[PDB]
Structure formats: structure tokens, C-alpha cells
């Protein structure tokens, strides 16, 4: 581990005991799985051996999650919920212990609602978390309802769109504290209100606060001259 | 190198090209299975040969951590930023030990400059709400 991660871990432990949901909104590549797998080792009071954590995530991330537990903190055993209907059922039925943590696709949790709801997932990870940025989503409408105590968001970039999408992430973190997306315009100075709301439950970085010895990107806007066949079709359109 | 594109049809064109110029290549459209994603990723890391990886920003990239890439190319740009920013950093991360270069390919006077202008206007709005 590293110092910014260890600060994030004592910050997590403070919010966990305070009963406060929040966002580990550090820049991409600073390491939100490594900054959260240590929860099982730090919150050592056997709660996490008697009952499960769970991870809600986009299908491509089911790569590293079922790998990283086995090399960072193999003390906690893991049973992913992805693959064929019959195969995931044959994994799942015996949760009705080895179930320290479970890893999931959004497009499975949005379907199998009853079969997740019947198990008391104590503490929640939700990941690449921009997926919840709209209250019109059947994802957001369902995911509000799981009876976990603490919800943790791993936003690879937080927020960063129109005010209904700010509200959609915020009202998933806190079901209270906020009245409506229409009134939340009042919650230059409105930026400082958003900052003073976010400061107690979102972390921040910028990579240079960690990466003293890794490169900045060279970024090239490369223009191209489109061809004859392109000009002919483009002009016809 | 990583190449990002937003049409599975364009990833087919890019595959037919990289087959044809004998590059060695590997692709992850949203039609690929979870076991296949895990196979392609673990074979793009750990191995010295595979020159180029083909991706979509809203499926192929998501948290997939290709530390073995040295460089990134956008053959497409989205109407929202952040997807491109994530797409870069799915290579540009603490597991690298290297220089990083990123390229965007754009046609002047077409429609992609509207996408870049909305992306710039959004990126400026998107900065102030963080820092």
C-alpha cells in the first residue's frame, strides 16, 4: 500500500463507523480496488467473516476483481456471479463461511433482484460508478433498494455532467439530505455549496499529488484530410 | 498501442486492415463474452508479440487496466468527455514505468469538430465542478 491509500483507509474506517456513505473519487490509475480491498483486513472485527461484502460493476472489470483479492488480501474468499444462468445458480444456491465477497455485472443485478435481496449484503462497493448517473435508469431504480449499511462509490471520474445527473449519484449515496433535483440548483457561490456538501463524503487527488515519477501524457490532436470518396459522400449528405 | 472506436462496424474495418498488414492484433467489442475479455486482456499483458488492441470506449475499456500498452489512439470521440479520459487512463496508470503518448484522429470541416467543440465546452464546465 501507499500513503494516500492509507489516509483513504482511515477516512473509510471513520465513515464506516460513523455510518456515512461516500465516493473514493481519486483519478483513474491511482487504484480504487487497492484503496478498497484493504477494508476486509482493516475492519477486522469478524463482521466481514460472518456476513458478505458485494461488488457491483461493469462486465469488463470482472477481470481484475476475482484476481486482485487472491494477491492483495487472499484471507477473504470470493465467489463471482457471472457466466451461464445454470452455472451462476450452481454457485449461488448455497448462500441460502466461504462467501466473504461476491463480484457482479450490472446487467445481472438489474435482473436477479429477489435472489440478491434475500441475502443481507452488509457493505456495498459500486464500481466504474458513472453507470448510476441517471434516475431514469432501471439500474438506479433497483440499486437503491438493497439493505446494506455503508455504500461506497468507485467513480473513475465523479459527476461531470448536468444537475439531474449530480442528483442521481448524490441521492444514491444519501436517500436523505436532498429534497429534489429542481431545488438542488441552490445546493459562483453554488459551486462552494456543492464543494461543502461533497468534502465530508468524497475524496480528491489530481495524479501529481501521488505520481512524482510517472509521465504526463503527450496528447496529439491529429487532423486528417478526408479523401475524394469521403468528400463526394459528405457533400451528398 | 490501444485503438478506440465507437462503431463495431468500424472495429470490423480496423480488424480487416490489421489482418491485412499482418500486424498481430486483438479486439474486445461489447459482443465479446466475459471469459473472452479476461483471456484477451491476460494475453495482451504478459506477452511480447501482440502489437495492437482494438476497443470501444463504453465497453472494451471499462476498468480493464492495460498496463502493457505504451500508447493510445482514438479513432473516434464521444459526445461526452470522461469516456475518453477513462479510455486513456485504462493505459495511463500506476502499473506503468514509461512515457505516455495519446493521439486523436479528426477530419477538418466535417462534423467531428462539433464533437470536439462540445467536448471542449463540456470539459471546461467539467473542470470547475471538481477544481
Amino acid at each position: 500500500l501507499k500513503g494516500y491509500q492509507l489516509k483513504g483507509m482511515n477516512w473509510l474506517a471513520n465513515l464506516y463507523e460513523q455510518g456515512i456513505n461516500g465516493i473514493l473519487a481519486d483519478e483513474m490509475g491511482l487504484g480504487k480496488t487497492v484503496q478498497s480491498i484493504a477494508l476486509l483486513a482493516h475492519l477486522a472485527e469478524r463482521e466481514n467473516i460472518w456476513g458478505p461484502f458485494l461488488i457491483i460493476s461493469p462486465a469488463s472489470t470482472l477481470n481484475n476483481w476475482h484476481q486482485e483479492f487472491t494477491r492483495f488480501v487472499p484471507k477473504f474468499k470470493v465467489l463471482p456471479y457471472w457466466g451461464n444462468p445454470h452455472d451462476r445458480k450452481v454457485i449461488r444456491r448455497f448462500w441460502s463461511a466461504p462467501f466473504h465477497v461476491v463480484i457482479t455485472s450490472y446487467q445481472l443485478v438489474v435482473q436477479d433482484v429477489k435472489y440478491f435481496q434475500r441475502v443481507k449484503w452488509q457493505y456495498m462497493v459500486l464500481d466504474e460508478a458513472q453507470a448510476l448517473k441517471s434516475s431514469s435508469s432501471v439500474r438506479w431504480k433497483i440499486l437503491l433498494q438493497f439493505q446494506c449499511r455503508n455504500r461506497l462509490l468507485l467513480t473513475g471520474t465523479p459527476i461531470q455532467n448536468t444537475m439531474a445527473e449530480l442528483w442521481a449519484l448524490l441521492h444514491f449515496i444519501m436517500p436523505t439530505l436532498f429534497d429534489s433535483h429542481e431545488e438542488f440548483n441552490e445546493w459562483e457561490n453554488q459551486l462552494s455549496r456543492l464543494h461543502m456538501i461533497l468534502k465530508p463524503f468524497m475524496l480528491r487527488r489530481i495524479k501529481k499529488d501521488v505520481e512524482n515519477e510517472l509521465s504526463d501524457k503527450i496528447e496529439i490532436l491529429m487532423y486528417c484530410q478526408l479523401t475524394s470518396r469521403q468528400k463526394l459522400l459528405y457533400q451528398a449528405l | 498501442v490501444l485503438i478506440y472506436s465507437q462503431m463495431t462496424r468500424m472495429i470490423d474495418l480496423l480488424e480487416e486492415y490489421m489482418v491485412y498488414r499482418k500486424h498481430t492484433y486483438m479486439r474486445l467489442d461489447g459482443s465479446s463474452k466475459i471469459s473472452e475479455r479476461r483471456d484477451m486482456v491476460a494475453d495482451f499483458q504478459n506477452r511480447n508479440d501482440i502489437f495492437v488492441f482494438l476497443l470501444s470506449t463504453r465497453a472494451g475499456g471499462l476498468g480493464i487496466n492495460l498496463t502493457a500498452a505504451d500508447t493510445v489512439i482514438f479513432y473516434d470521440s464521444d459526445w461526452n468527455p470522461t469516456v475518453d479520459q477513462q479510455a486513456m487512463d485504462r493505459a495511463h496508470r500506476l502499473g506503468q514505468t514509461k512515457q505516455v503518448t495519446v493521439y486523436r484522429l479528426i477530419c477538418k470541416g466535417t462534423i467531428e469538430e462539433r464533437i470536439l467543440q462540445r467536448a471542449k465546452e463540456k470539459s471546461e464546465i467539467q473542470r470547475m465542478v471538481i477544481s
Binding site: 476475482h66 470470493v78 465467489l79 463471482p80 452455472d87 466461504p98 | 471469459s35 479476461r38 491476460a42
Partner: peptide, 29 residues
């Protein structure tokens, strides 16, 4: 005369974790 389920129970019980673990290691690659 009455404990006779145990020698059936054990044969299923050892299958549960084995097949769940087998499927959870198709998740290796």
C-alpha cells in the same frame, strides 16, 4: 435403522462446494 440419511447427506454435501468451486475456477482465464 434411523441414522440412514447420513451416508446419503455426505455424498451430496461434498458435491456442493466442489461443483461451485469448479465453476468459480472456469472464472480463472
Amino acid at each position: 435403522l434411523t441414522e440412514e440419511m447420513l451416508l446419503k447427506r455426505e455424498e451430496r454435501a461434498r458435491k456442493r462446494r466442489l461443483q461451485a468451486a469448479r465453476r468459480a475456477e472456469e472464472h480463472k482465464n
